[PDB]
Each structure stands twice: as C-alpha cells, then as structure tokens.
Design a binder for this molecule. Sequence first.
Ligand SMILES: OC[C@H]1O[C@@H](O[C@H]2[C@H](O)[C@@H](O)[C@H](O[C@H]3[C@H](O)[C@@H](O)[C@H](O[C@H]4[C@H](O)[C@@H](O)[C@H](O)O[C@@H]4CO)O[C@@H]3CO)O[C@@H]2CO)[C@H](O)[C@@H](O)[C@@H]1O
Length: 224
Amino acid sequence: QIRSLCELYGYWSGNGYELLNNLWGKDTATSGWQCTYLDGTNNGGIQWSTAWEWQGAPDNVKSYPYVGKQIQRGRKISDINSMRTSVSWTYDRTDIRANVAYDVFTARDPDHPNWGGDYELMIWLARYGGIYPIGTFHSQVNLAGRTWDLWTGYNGNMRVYSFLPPSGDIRDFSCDIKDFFNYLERNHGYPAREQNLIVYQVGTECFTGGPARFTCRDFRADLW
Ligand SMILES: OC[C@H]1O[C@@H](O[C@H]2[C@H](O)[C@@H](O)[C@H](O[C@H]3[C@H](O)[C@@H](O)[C@H](O[C@H]4[C@H](O)[C@@H](O)[C@H](O)O[C@@H]4CO)O[C@@H]3CO)O[C@@H]2CO)[C@H](O)[C@@H](O)[C@@H]1O
C-alpha cells in the first residue's frame, strides 16, 4: 500500500478524493480494530482496501471506512445534472455482519458538517450477516439497470433512503446517483431545490465478524 491509515480517523486526500479510517462507532465494540489502506490512485480513480475484526453490539455499526469525492459546498441537488460513479470490489468472506454502500448526505444548511444531514441516500451493493438498513421496506424501484428494495426511515431527525439488492451482492457497479435523487424528487417529495450536497462516498459499514478484508479494485466518481 501507498499509505496505511490505521489511526482512528486516519485521513488522506489527493486527486479530488479523500479516504478515511472512519471508525465512528468503535467504542461500542468489545474487541477489535480496523485499518484502511490507499493502494493506488491510478487512471482517474482510487484503489483501496480495509481490513478489520470487530466483536460486540451486533446492531451497532463500528465503522464506515470510505473513499469520498471532494465537493464544493452550496450545490443544490436540483442544480447537479449528473453524479456518475463506478466501483469494483471484493470481500474475502461473507460470514460477517457488514455491507458495501454508497453514502450521500444532503442538508438545507450548505455548511452542515460531514457526519450527517437532513437526508441520507444509500445504495447498498452487499448485505451480509442478516443486517438491516434504517427503517422499513417501502417499495421496489427500477434504477441503474437493476431492481432495488427501497427502505426508508429516520436516524434521529435525518430521513434515510436505502436502496438494497433483493438478492446477492453487486461487486461491479456503475450508476448515476442523480437517477436515484430524481426518483426521490418525483415520487417521495424529496426537496432537491432546497437541499445541498454534503458528502458523496462509497465504503463498507462493518458491524461484527472477521478477520475480513474489503478490496476496492477501483472507484471513480464525478459530478457535473
Ligand atoms: O452517527 C454519526 C456517524 O454517521 C455515519 O454515517 C452513518 C449514518 O449516520 C447512518 O444513518 C448509516 O448507518 C446505519 C446503517 O446503514 C444501518 O444498517 C444501521 O441499522 C441498524 C439500526 O440502527 C438498528 O436500529 C437496527 O436494530 O439494526 C440495524 C442493523 O441491522 O443503522 C446505522 C446507523 O445507526 O450510514 C452511515 C455510515 O455508517 C458517518 O459516516 C460518520 O461520519 C458519523 O460520525
């Protein structure tokens, strides 16, 4: 690896991207740790990985190490035409409580901190070990060439929309996240004209299990 980010909130940035050893829930663990590795910044993308083992509190996320596309504050979702992104990844085992997911926060306050927002949009590419997203099943949705189970609910005051694979995982994926926002704007009253983009990330929420290793063979993200 080029860089080893094994500290709590170990951080790298470059080429318009950032990487964080985001162990935000680790104090709920009874044992374990996690490191995030920058493997490469080849071909306009990021190659990275994270190794971990966690025990305790099986409904509590211990971490969400991520790669993020850096963005300028104050961009209304309605004024973003496209959020084209692709990811290729593997997990070395699936007998773990973990996901792989895109995470996007928006807020009416353009200076909202990066830990949350008024709304959260997740796109899950894996759902291992019997975990659930926030909330309850809403409906099925056709986007990005696939069918999704949309779940909705609240984390505090924040409305969370999670799009899940009905079956299996999706280890090679590409989409335009604006298709997902546009769907929410039309059918869920999502106030895109009032909401500013806060973060634009992909990573893995880790609950329990391991030793496990997530490898992101390639990540790219753009927005116009
Ligand atoms: O909290 C600040 C922290 O947030 C991090 O971002 C979180 C979002 O806050 C969060 O909404 C979301 O994590 C979800 C996860 O997707 C769900 O699978 C999980 O569901 C739990 C649920 O909470 C329980 O009630 C239920 O019984 O069990 C299920 C699991 O089976 O809930 C969590 C939130 O608790 O996604 C984001 C990534 O972790 C930020 O990354 C960080 O910066 C912030 O400090």
